Write a protein that binds this ligand. Structure first.
Ligand SMILES: [Mg+2]
Ligand SMILES: [Mg+2]
Ligand SMILES: [Mg+2]
Ligand SMILES: [Mg+2]
Ligand SMILES: [Mg+2]
Ligand SMILES: [Mg+2]
Ligand SMILES: [Mg+2]
Ligand SMILES: [Mg+2]
Ligand SMILES: [Mg+2]
Ligand SMILES: [Mg+2]
Ligand SMILES: [Mg+2]
Ligand SMILES: [Mg+2]
Ligand SMILES: [Mg+2]
Ligand SMILES: [Mg+2]
Ligand SMILES: [Mg+2]
Ligand SMILES: [Mg+2]
Ligand SMILES: [Mg+2]
Ligand SMILES: [Mg+2]
Ligand SMILES: [Mg+2]
Ligand SMILES: [Mg+2]
Ligand SMILES: [Mg+2]
Ligand SMILES: [Mg+2]
Ligand SMILES: [Mg+2]
Ligand SMILES: [Mg+2]
Ligand SMILES: [Mg+2]
Ligand SMILES: [Mg+2]
Ligand SMILES: [Mg+2]
Ligand SMILES: [Mg+2]
Ligand SMILES: [Mg+2]
Ligand SMILES: [Mg+2]
Ligand SMILES: [Mg+2]
Ligand SMILES: [Mg+2]
Ligand SMILES: [Mg+2]
Ligand SMILES: [Mg+2]
Ligand SMILES: [Mg+2]
Ligand SMILES: [Mg+2]
Ligand SMILES: [Mg+2]
Ligand SMILES: [Mg+2]
Ligand SMILES: [Mg+2]
Ligand SMILES: [Mg+2]
Ligand SMILES: [Mg+2]
Ligand SMILES: [Mg+2]
Ligand SMILES: [Mg+2]
Ligand SMILES: [Mg+2]
Ligand SMILES: [Mg+2]
Ligand SMILES: [Mg+2]
Ligand SMILES: [Mg+2]
Ligand SMILES: [Mg+2]
Ligand SMILES: [Mg+2]
Ligand SMILES: [Mg+2]
Ligand SMILES: [Mg+2]
Ligand SMILES: [Mg+2]
Ligand SMILES: [Mg+2]
Ligand SMILES: [Mg+2]
Ligand SMILES: [Mg+2]
Ligand SMILES: [Mg+2]
Ligand SMILES: [Mg+2]
Ligand SMILES: [Mg+2]
Ligand SMILES: [Mg+2]
Ligand SMILES: [Mg+2]
Ligand SMILES: [Mg+2]
Ligand SMILES: [Mg+2]
Ligand SMILES: [Mg+2]
Ligand SMILES: [Mg+2]
Ligand SMILES: [Mg+2]
Ligand SMILES: [Mg+2]
Ligand SMILES: [Mg+2]
Ligand SMILES: [Mg+2]
Ligand SMILES: [Mg+2]
Ligand SMILES: [Mg+2]
Ligand SMILES: [Mg+2]
Ligand SMILES: [Mg+2]
Ligand SMILES: [Mg+2]
Ligand SMILES: [Mg+2]
Ligand SMILES: [Mg+2]
Ligand SMILES: [Mg+2]
Ligand SMILES: [Mg+2]
Ligand SMILES: [Mg+2]
Ligand SMILES: [Mg+2]
Ligand SMILES: [Mg+2]
Ligand SMILES: [Mg+2]
Ligand SMILES: [Mg+2]
Ligand SMILES: [Zn+2]
Lengths: 138, 99, 208, 122, 151
RNA sequence: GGGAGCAAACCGGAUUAGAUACCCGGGUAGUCCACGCCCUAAACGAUGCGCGCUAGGUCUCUGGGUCUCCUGGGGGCCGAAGCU
RNA sequence: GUAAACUCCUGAACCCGGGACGAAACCCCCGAGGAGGGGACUGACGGUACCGGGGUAAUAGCGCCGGCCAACUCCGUGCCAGCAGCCGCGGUAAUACGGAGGGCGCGAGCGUUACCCGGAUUCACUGGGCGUAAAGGGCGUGUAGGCGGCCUGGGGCGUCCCAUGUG
């Protein structure tokens, strides 16, 4: 049945990028997209587009990565260092404005659904609002 | 303003009185997760109108009796025995405890 | 009370010329130029590898000893330094330097910060005309640290002025030996003081 | 433990017990000697330790160590009980306070006089 | 050229008929006090020698550190398997609030204002390795938008 | 109820300083059946259940597809990344 | 150990003189007993604070000194005497007992006992774990409760924002 589709995708992404996949799919969701479009517009992923796998609608997320590395283990640095679901289904997380998370001294993003829409930490404080802290990435 | 809340009637036995069960949601003050608790109020029904399974609004009101400090503001719907189910079965289980 | 006990024994602890005497400390010794080693029968044996504690400790030992101040009044200032919004490290020192018993020393009316305290408690000083005998007095900017009227004619007062003649004085300060007064201009910046202590260690030590 | 579990069962508090039932949480307690005597210590050591059993105002009855060399406690010496286990002797939960009541101070001692009720000698 | 300060010097020991023979560990930190920093554990049948070895092994393994006014680009949590350490940026006038081991690192690293804490284990040798691995993953704004550029 | 073999307890032989044991000769509940209780265990993978995600190589069981291979569901071993 | 002695300087204490702020209103006259104005009495602390004058170098104590924890030597002692918060020290060579010399840390205080929070991230929401370290229920069926896929629409409880009362 899969409990939380959201943290699932963030995991698909995570498990994928640790092996340096070109891109990996994920079930279709209007709300799931906003997370991606924001994740791309902020430059964590190259982008995405709907697909179809045996009738099943999906969303191909094209992964971004750093350059090769010198010395032992030429492991290319990661773009998405750390994605992590915050507001979990078993324990909702709703935040006002005057305490919205500040991820890694600005060097990080922090998504959060809101009464206006899916916005980031900085973009949310723009309009000055708050809502379910979807997750943090950096 | 006179406090008001809705709840399911779940007792028609008393004369000119009914029992309303009302839920309220609120986050755990240390564990966040939103949680639900409930309470039963004794509503004054002078017209013996409202019956079992009714969802109704009640209002903080003049003390009618020892436990009655509310009145049935207005009905909301009839078919709601599904809730009366969960409440009764809850009381069913108590049997399977005390030894 | 101050270290009423021997003074030159303290310098011999950090292996540093702690200036706290006067004429003598510029002679051939703050007691130093003949005994560059710690007191006691030991000391002049192979010194011990000081622990992180040993150091950070004794760094704080200097800064305090330098102003001949009590641990009580001392840490009260450091803590207060922590309260006000700014670089606690340096801020401390400025507050530490705003001491009246110390301003009179910086203004050179007094040979040492100790002689300065005596002159001060003895009321020989005054701020903005009004008399003051509280060596702890927090000296405000624009305050006139003048020598008391009946005090001017004293010999010891003159001699310390006969040495402050021409020779410059703190950049945050103005002498005026003619009027025998002075002036607290502004709270010193880090550099304007040249204390032998790294103020960062002193903060560290205040965490235990 | 899932958050729901925490919402239910909840995390248990700690709660600790008092190594010293001097009772009333009193910092001290007057008592009266009843058996002053010497006792051998535990495993790794050996020496004849000077202890004294004492009936408290608390209706109790307890052994208490007597610190320092030599003393003057008899079968009825009233004396102030301090509290502080002696690791060497089994069942000793309290030190006796030198310098108070029939608890005479330590003679001749010059260092650490405070901890043994010794006056400043000329 | 750089700077030297040993973290610890232990005397391990192996068994063998007739008796036990020893050795000596030596963990040393090195840095220019401005950006260059390196740590090296060295072990030799003799102390001075072992310290010396730690010297070489130290000056060997190095790492540039993105200081910034004296603090750090951003707080980080790094679990070196068993031990865990957390560094956090701090406004000037603070100081080096850290344990002994991670202090000698950051101090000989130009760093001056930083908050730390050790969790999980607390074994020096491991807290050490944990601190190095910690510093490595520090990324500057330039470092960030460089990768996040993708151009 | 049934009881061939085996076999705690029990008896004898031997061993040993002793030998309520290991070995040997005997031997009764029990082991089996019907019905009713008991409800424990190293009831061990010492690994709660479900769902998705993250290289492969090889052995084996079982099913489908014209089949030196592809496609499901089990039982193993070695091992990416990773975890420890 | 510049420590003292010694030379010089200043002058807590003690003495002399002056000496309050705290107190303007009730009250009295003009005007109306009003608004406005003017006038008078009242101080327990207190001969106190503070001011001016004269004026003597004039109490230091406690904890610690093996590691943590930092400040070392001599002697006496000999698993005795004793220390002790933990690890431990002493069985005739103790920087761990006691005294001394010296030293460190505080200073009119210094230590001790008790109790609370800390450290303890050691009940872990922040922020912990369960193959062998303590920890998966012997296995199932299922009640309440907890949780829940993709698209559209209504309501707007949770959630978010503004304003205001309250705090
Ligand atoms: Mg997670
Ligand atoms: Mg009634
Ligand atoms: Mg009635
Ligand atoms: Mg019963
Ligand atoms: Mg003193
Ligand atoms: Mg600021
Ligand atoms: Mg208990
Ligand atoms: Mg004690
Ligand atoms: Mg008394
Ligand atoms: Mg006395
Ligand atoms: Mg790893
Ligand atoms: Mg039979
Ligand atoms: Mg039978
Ligand atoms: Mg047989
Ligand atoms: Mg047999
Ligand atoms: Mg028989
Ligand atoms: Mg026998
Ligand atoms: Mg037998
Ligand atoms: Mg027999
Ligand atoms: Mg028998
Ligand atoms: Mg037999
Ligand atoms: Mg045998
Ligand atoms: Mg038989
Ligand atoms: Mg039986
Ligand atoms: Mg049978
Ligand atoms: Mg059978
Ligand atoms: Mg049968
Ligand atoms: Mg039965
Ligand atoms: Mg059974
Ligand atoms: Mg098994
Ligand atoms: Mg399993
Ligand atoms: Mg098939
Ligand atoms: Mg073939
Ligand atoms: Mg297949
Ligand atoms: Mg099978
Ligand atoms: Mg398989
Ligand atoms: Mg002198
Ligand atoms: Mg002296
Ligand atoms: Mg003279
Ligand atoms: Mg005079
Ligand atoms: Mg008079
Ligand atoms: Mg008056
Ligand atoms: Mg008056
Ligand atoms: Mg008045
Ligand atoms: Mg009139
Ligand atoms: Mg007027
Ligand atoms: Mg008057
Ligand atoms: Mg008058
Ligand atoms: Mg008067
Ligand atoms: Mg009075
Ligand atoms: Mg006078
Ligand atoms: Mg005179
Ligand atoms: Mg005088
Ligand atoms: Mg004198
Ligand atoms: Mg004194
Ligand atoms: Mg004292
Ligand atoms: Mg102490
Ligand atoms: Mg000692
Ligand atoms: Mg001798
Ligand atoms: Mg001697
Ligand atoms: Mg002698
Ligand atoms: Mg003994
Ligand atoms: Mg002692
Ligand atoms: Mg021994
Ligand atoms: Mg000796
Ligand atoms: Mg000791
Ligand atoms: Mg003596
Ligand atoms: Mg001494
Ligand atoms: Mg002190
Ligand atoms: Mg104390
Ligand atoms: Mg206590
Ligand atoms: Mg505690
Ligand atoms: Mg624990
Ligand atoms: Mg505990
Ligand atoms: Mg237990
Ligand atoms: Mg176990
Ligand atoms: Mg199991
Ligand atoms: Mg189960
Ligand atoms: Mg069971
Ligand atoms: Mg809707
Ligand atoms: Mg709300
Ligand atoms: Mg408000
Ligand atoms: Zn000197």
């Amino acid at each position: 049945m899969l409990t939380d589709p959201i943290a699932d995708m963030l995991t698909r992404i995570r498990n994928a990028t640790r092996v340096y996949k070109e891109s990996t799919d994920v079930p279709a969701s209007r709300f799931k997209e906003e997370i991606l479009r924001i994740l791309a517009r902020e430059g964590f992923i190259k982008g995405y587009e709907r697909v179809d796998v045996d009738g099943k609608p999906y969303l191909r997320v094209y992964l971004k990565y750093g350059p090769r590395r010198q010395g032992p283990d030429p492991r290319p640095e990661q773009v998405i260092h750390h994605i992590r679901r915050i507001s979990k289904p078993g324990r909702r997380v709703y935040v006002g404005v005057k305490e919205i998370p500040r991820v890694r001294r600005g060097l990080g993003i922090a998504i959060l659904s809101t009464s206006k829409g899916v916005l980031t930490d900085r973009e949310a404080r723009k309009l000055g609002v708050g809502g379910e802290l979807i997750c943090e990435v950096w | 303003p006179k406090k008001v809340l809705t709840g399911v009637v779940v007792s028609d036995k008393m004369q000119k009185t009914v029992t309303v069960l009302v839920e309220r949601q609120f986050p755990h003050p240390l564990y966040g997760k939103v949680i639900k608790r409930s309470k039963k109020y004794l509503a004054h029904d002078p017209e013996e109108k409202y019956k079992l399974g009714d969802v109704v609004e009640i209002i903080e009101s003049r003390p009618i009796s020892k436990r009655k400090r509310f009145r049935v503001l207005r009905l909301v719907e009839s078919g709601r025995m599904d809730l009366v189910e969960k409440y009764l079965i809850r009381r069913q289980n108590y049997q399977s405890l005390s030894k | 009370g101050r270290y009423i006990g021997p003074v030159c024994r303290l310098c011999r602890r950090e292996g540093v010329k702690l200036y706290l005497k006067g004429e003598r400390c510029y002679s051939p010794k703050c007691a130093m130029e003949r005994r560059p080693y710690p007191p006691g029968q030991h000391g002049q044996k192979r010194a011990r590898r000081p622990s992180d504690y040993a150091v950070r400790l004794r760094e704080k030992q200097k800064l305090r000893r330098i102003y001949g101040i009590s641990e009580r009044q001392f840490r009260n200032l450091f803590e207060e330094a922590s309260k006000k919004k700014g670089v606690t490290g340096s801020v401390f020192l400025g507050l530490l330097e705003s001491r009246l018993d110390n301003v009179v020393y910086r203004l050179g009316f007094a040979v040492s910060r100790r002689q300065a305290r005596q002159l001060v408690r003895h009321g020989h000083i005054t701020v903005n005309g009004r008399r003051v005998d509280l060596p702890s007095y927090r000296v405000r900017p624009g305050d006139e640290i003048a020598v008391a009227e009946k005090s001017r004619n004293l010999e010891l007062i003159r001699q310390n002025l006969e040495a402050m003649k021409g020779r410059k004085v703190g950049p945050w300060l103005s002498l005026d030996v003619e009027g025998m007064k002075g002036k607290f201009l502004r709270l010193p910046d880090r550099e304007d003081l040249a204390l032998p202590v790294n103020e960062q260690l002193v903060i560290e030590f205040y965490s235990r | 433990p899932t958050i729901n579990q925490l919402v239910r069962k909840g995390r248990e508090k700690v709660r600790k017990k008092s190594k010293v039932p001097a009772l009333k949480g009193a910092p001290f307690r007057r008592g009266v000697c009843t058996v002053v005597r010497t006792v051998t210590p535990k495993k790794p050591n050996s020496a004849l330790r000077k202890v004294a059993k004492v009936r408290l105002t608390s209706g109790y009855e307890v052994t208490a160590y007597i610190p320092g060399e030599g003393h003057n406690l008899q079968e009825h010496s009233v004396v102030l009980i301090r509290g502080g286990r002696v690791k060497d002797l089994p069942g000793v939960r309290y030190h006796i306070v030198r310098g108070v009541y029939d608890a005479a101070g330590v003679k001749d001692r010059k260092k650490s006089r405070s901890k043994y009720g010794t006056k400043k000698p000329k | 050229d750089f700077e030297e300060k040993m973290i610890l010097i232990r005397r391990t020991a192996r068994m063998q008929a007739g008796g036990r023979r020893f050795r000596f560990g030596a963990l040393v930190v090195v840095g220019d006090r401005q950006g260059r920093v390196g740590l090296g554990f060295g072990k030799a049948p003799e102390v001075p020698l072992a310290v010396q070895k730690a010297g070489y092994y130290a000056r060997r393994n190095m790492v540039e550190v993105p200081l910034q006014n004296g603090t750090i680009p951003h707080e980080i949590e790094v679990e070196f398997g068993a031990s865990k350490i957390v560094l956090k940026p701090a406004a000037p006038g603070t100081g080096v609030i850290a344990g002994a081991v991670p202090r000698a690192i950051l101090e000989l690293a130009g760093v001056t204002d930083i908050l730390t804490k050790e969790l999980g284990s607390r074994n020096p040798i491991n807290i050490a390795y944990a601190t190095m691995e910690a510093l490595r993953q520090l990324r500057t704004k330039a470092d960030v938008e460089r990768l996040r550029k993708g151009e």
